[PDB]
Amino acid sequence: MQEQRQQLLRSLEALIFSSEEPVNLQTLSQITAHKFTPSELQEAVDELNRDYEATGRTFRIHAIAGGYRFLTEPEFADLVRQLLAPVIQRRLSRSMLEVLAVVAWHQPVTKGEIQQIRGASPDYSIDRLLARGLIEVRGRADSPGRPLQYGTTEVFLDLFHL
Amino acid sequence: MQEQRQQLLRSLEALIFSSEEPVNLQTLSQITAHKFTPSELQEAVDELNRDYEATGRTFRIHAIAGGYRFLTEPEFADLVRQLLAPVIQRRLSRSMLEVLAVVAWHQPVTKGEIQQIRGASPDYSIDRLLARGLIEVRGRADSPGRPLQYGTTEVFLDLFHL
């Protein structure tokens, strides 16, 4: 029964590792065709984590809200940050989101108006949002030069499940 | 040639009206199989807008950056706002976007931390963003109670073309 236990342990590892979403007790028991008890499953996970600690692996399995998933050790948090969220990427993401937020709330709104509310540089967020179909022109403001006013799109609403 | 002109005018209306995107001179000339000059096209559009004014229609064709599209008259701007962007919808949209923005910039970040930065109520923005796959857990903070930290997802990045 040692081998069977080890093979079952290997199967859990492969499933949790392959998962593109936290995997629960129900899913793991159905696929391994093993009637895992909540306590038995956690015990198997503990053993794997013990082996990771033993062999010097940089990741661990975590039980988050009933779903197990791998996470890298806090020791490499800075490195992971530079990979998943480098500064420049964060700047682009933040700026697009903030401008989008201003449009969502103040629409119909002009570039000049968005600038006033934000107090920016300004930048190319409007062009980026238009190129992605998240905002569109709603008309022209009644002000000097009749600047274009923007509003969010059904494309934006559908995507964000509003 | 009156009938041909009128039929061509009707075709332009139908195309511009059906468009789910501003339609340019190139597209309109290819579909109507008519070699429109930039001046001739604007003149046809002016005639249609004259008929809209004459019959009391609530919309007009506008030339925005080389693309023509229908827009409703400013006289009904308030009504249109209540339809396309009612207050409650705007609140949901803004809150989700602002929290998303805070995560994009401050990740990995906890709910407590997001609250501090925003100075909110708080709300259910994190749950909403998790349910949409835009954010995910990155680990647990080194603070009392070890609260979950969040970060954006490749799903978010791919969707926003980062």
Identity of the amino acid at B40: E
Give chain A positions within 8 Å (CB) of B105: 90, 93-94
Q: How far apart are CA A43 and CA A21, in angstroms?
A: 21
Planar angle of CA B135, B138, B144, nearest 5 degrees: 115
Contact state of A85 with B93 under an 8 Å Cβ cutoff: no
For this PDB entry, the determination method is X-ray
| Cβ atoms A60, A49 nearer than 8 A | yes
Query: 3-class secondary structure for chain B?
Result: CHHHHHHHHHHHHHHHHHCCCCECHHHHHHHCCCCCCHHHHHHHHHHHHHHHHHHCCCEEEEEECCEEEEEECHHHHHHHHHHHCCHHHHHHHHHHHHHHHHHHHHCCECHHHHHHHHCCCCCCHHHHHHHCCCEEEEEECCCCCCCEEEEECHHHHHHCCC
- Where on the phi/psi map is residue B110: left (φ > 0), alpha (ψ -120 to 50), or beta? beta
Q: How many domains does chain B have?
A: 2
Chain A residues with CB-CB distance to B59 below 8 A: none
Contact criterion met (CB < 8 Å) for A148 and B101: no
Query: Domain check: are A50 and A93 in the same one?
Result: no
Do B76 and B131 lie in a common domain?
no
How many CA atoms, within 13 angstroms, populate the side-chain half-sphere of residue A114? 27
Q: Domain ends where: A66, A86, A106?
A: A86
Query: What is the distance between the alpha carbons of residues A153 and A57, in angstroms, rounded to a whole number?
Result: 46
> Distance between CA atoms of A5 and A7, rounded to whole angstroms?
6
Q: Say yes or no for a CB contact (<8 Å) between A94 and B81.
A: no
Interface A–B counts its CB contacts (< 8 A) at 96
Same domain? A9 vs A69: yes
Q: Of the candidates B69, B104, B148, which has its C-beta nearest A93's C-beta?
A: B104
Question: Are A147 and A140 contacting, i.e. CB atoms less than 8 angstroms apart?
Answer: yes
Q: How many CB atoms lie within 10 A of CB B63?
A: 15
**H or E segment and range at residue A130:** helix A125-131
Domain membership of residue A107 as a residue range = 87-162
DSSP A62: E
Residue with tokens 């609403």: A157
**Residue type present at position B82:** Q
Q: Tell me how far apart the alpha carbons of residues A19 and A76 are, in angstroms, rounded to a whole number.
A: 22
- CATH code at position B21: 1.10.10.10
Contact B137 A64 (CB under 8 A): yes
Looking only at the bridges linking them, the beta strands covering A148-152 and B59-64 are unpaired
d(CA A96, CA A107): 16
For residue A52, count other CB atoms closer than 10 A to its CB.
17
Long-range contacts for A21-28 (Cβ within 8 Å, ≥24 apart)? A21/A67, A21/A69, A22/A64, A22/A65, A22/A66, A22/A67, A22/A68, A22/A69, A23/A67, A23/A68, A23/A69, A24/A66, A24/A67, A24/A68, A25/A66, A28/A68
Cross-strand bridge partners of residue A148:
A140
**Nearest Cα residue in chain A from B87:** A105
Q: Nearest chain B residue to A74 by CA: give it.
A: B139
Of A74, A101, A142, the CB nearest to B98: A101
Interface of A with B (CB under 8 A): 62, 64, 69, 71, 74, 77, 80-81, 84-85, 89-90, 92-94, 96-98, 100-101, 104-105, 107-108, 132, 137-139, 142, 148, 151-152, 156-157, 159-162
Q: Which residues of A touch B109 (CB under 8 A)?
A: none
Asked whether the beta carbons of B146 and B117 are under 8 A apart, the reply is: no
Residues B2 and B76 reside in one and the same domain: yes
Give yes or no: residues B58 and B112 share one domain.
no
Return d(Cα B90, Cα A105) in angstroms, integer: 5
Same domain, B21 and B81: yes
Q: In A, which residues are within 8 Å of B160 by CB distance?
A: 93, 96, 132
Nearest Cα of chain B lies from the Cα of A6 at a distance, in angstroms, of 28
CA A113 to CA A128: how far, in whole Å?
A: 18
Claim to verify: residue A72 and residue A97 sit in the same structural domain? no
d(CA A10, CA A162): 42
> Which amino acid would we find at residue A58?
T
The count of C-alpha atoms lying within 13 angstroms of the C-alpha of A35, restricted to the half-sphere facing its C-beta, is 0
CA B28 vs. chain centroid, Å, equals: 23
- A110 with A136, same domain? yes
Q: Note whether B57 and B125 are same-domain residues.
A: no
Same domain? For B72 and B96 the reply is no
Of A81, A152, A161, the CB nearest to B85: A152
Gap between the Cα atoms of A106 and A16, Å rounded: 44
At which of A86, A101, A128 does a domain end? A86
Domain final position from B51, B85, B119: B85
CA angle A86, A89, A95 (to 5 degrees): 135
CA angle, residues A45, A49, A54, in degrees to nearest 5: 145
Q: Bridge-partner residues for B109, per DSSP? A: B150
Please measure the distance between the N-terminal and C-terminal CA atoms of chain A and give it in whole angstroms. Answer: 52
| Pair (B52, B111) in one structural domain | no
Cα B34 from Cα B26, distance rounded (Å): 10
Tokens of B100: 């998303």
Q: Give the span between the Cα atoms of B25 and B36, in whole angstroms.
A: 7
- A150 CB neighbours in chain B (<8 A) are none
H-run or E-run covering A2: helix A2-18
Same domain for B94 and B79? no
Instruction: List all residues 6 or more positions away from A120 whose beta carbon is below 8 Å from its beta carbon.
Output: A95, A114
Element spanning A35, H or E: none
